[PDB]
Design a binder for these strands. Structure first.
Ligand SMILES: [Mg+2]
Ligand SMILES: [Mg+2]
Ligand SMILES: [Mg+2]
Length: 293
DNA sequence: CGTACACCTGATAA
DNA sequence: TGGAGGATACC
DNA sequence: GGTATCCTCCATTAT
DNA sequence: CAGGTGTACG
């Protein structure tokens, strides 16, 4: 685990969270907590174990869903000690940065015990209102006065290190093998390779910037909602640009075996064997093997 | 014959 | 992704 | 008591 | 994230 890879991976998968929960034991009647969270499927538990170890063995890993597990640090103290100084040095670049910085300001308030205070509380409520999904219904009603503190906007963010991209692709990227019915290929099917990164449209600009960074690909919009795709279909670019990149800058987690299989599919395609029935079945078999893992 | 971008849609693993 | 609620610990 | 963290579970949507 | 498909074009 490289630092930029981690930042990429968290740009893709992580969360920065604030809870303001109701409880009348607290002098304010409200308990304030901050949480840094990253959740993955079971097949990537070893990667959560790396992260913990990466962050000084801190925090806790727990069954989250039916086949996911979560890594969480919810101590304000140790968040201030370890997390904030990591992301302040190796900064996020998706819109998730806006949530990191707002989360940061809360911790800062918590750090001086202000959260235990009425003004403190409203500042944290004001800050929580611009983070992730905003105020809850309960908090809108308990704090009908508060004005969300403006979402910070940090313009034009560039990929700070090729490992960031390794990281993020390991999270929100994908190595696709498609077998497409073809009336004109003689073996019956086209063997397509697609590299693809998915992200919400709010990060259009970052998505656009990937075309210069990798010197290939194009961007599409999901017609069904605000979601973009950075896609590479062109096999020459996959051989020439994508495969060599991730060979130097390695994927993390399970997804790394899936890249290796896809690389292998590409060898078969390189020697033109995909147009042979034998090679088509090598590809069915590798494709079969992918995501297992 | 073969490939590649534009378009399409279902399943979760975030 | 991002959130909730109950239990427990800690000073 | 007041506060801070641990633990178990979940609805929706960005993957 | 992850499978497709339609079809223009060399
Ligand atoms: Mg993501
Ligand atoms: Mg993701
Ligand atoms: Mg992932």
């Amino acid at each position: 685990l490289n630092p930029w890879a981690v930042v990429g991976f968290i740009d893709a998968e992580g969360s920065f969270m604030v809870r303001v929960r109701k409880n009348s034991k607290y002098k304010t009647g409200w308990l304030v907590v901050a949480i840094f969270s990253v959740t993955v499927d079971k097949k990537d538990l070893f990667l959560l174990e790396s992260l913990k170890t990466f962050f000084g063995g801190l925090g806790s890993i727990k069954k989250s869903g039916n086949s996911t597990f979560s890594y969480r640090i919810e101590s304000s103290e140790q968040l201030t000690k370890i997390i904030l100084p990591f992301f302040d040095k190796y900064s996020l670049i998706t819109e998730k940065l806006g949530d990191y910085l707002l989360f940061k300001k809360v911790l800062e308030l918590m750090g001086t015990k202000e959260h235990l205070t009425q003004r403190g509380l409203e500042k944290i409520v004001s800050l929580k209102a611009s983070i992730n999904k905003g105020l809850s219904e309960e908090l809108q009603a308990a704090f009908p006065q508060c004005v969300p503190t403006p979402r910070p906007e940090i313009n034009n963010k560039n990929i700070p290190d090729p490992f960031w991209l390794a990281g993020f692709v390991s999270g929100d990227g994908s190595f696709k093998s498609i077998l497409k019915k073809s009336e004109s290929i003689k073996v019956g099917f086209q063997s397509i390779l697609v590299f693809q990164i998915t992200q919400h449209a709010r990060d259009v600009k970052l998505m656009e910037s990937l075309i210069s960074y990798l010197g290939c690909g194009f961007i599409e919009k999901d017609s069904r909602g605000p979601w973009l795709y950075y896609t590479v279909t062109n096999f020459s670019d996959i051989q020439g640009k994508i495969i060599p990149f991730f060979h130097q800058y390695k994927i993390i987690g399970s997804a790394y075996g899936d890249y290796q299989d896809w690389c292998k599919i590409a060898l078969i395609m390189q020697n033109k064997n995909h147009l042979t029935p034998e090679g088509l079945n090598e590809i069915r078999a590798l494709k079969g093997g992918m995501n297992k893992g």
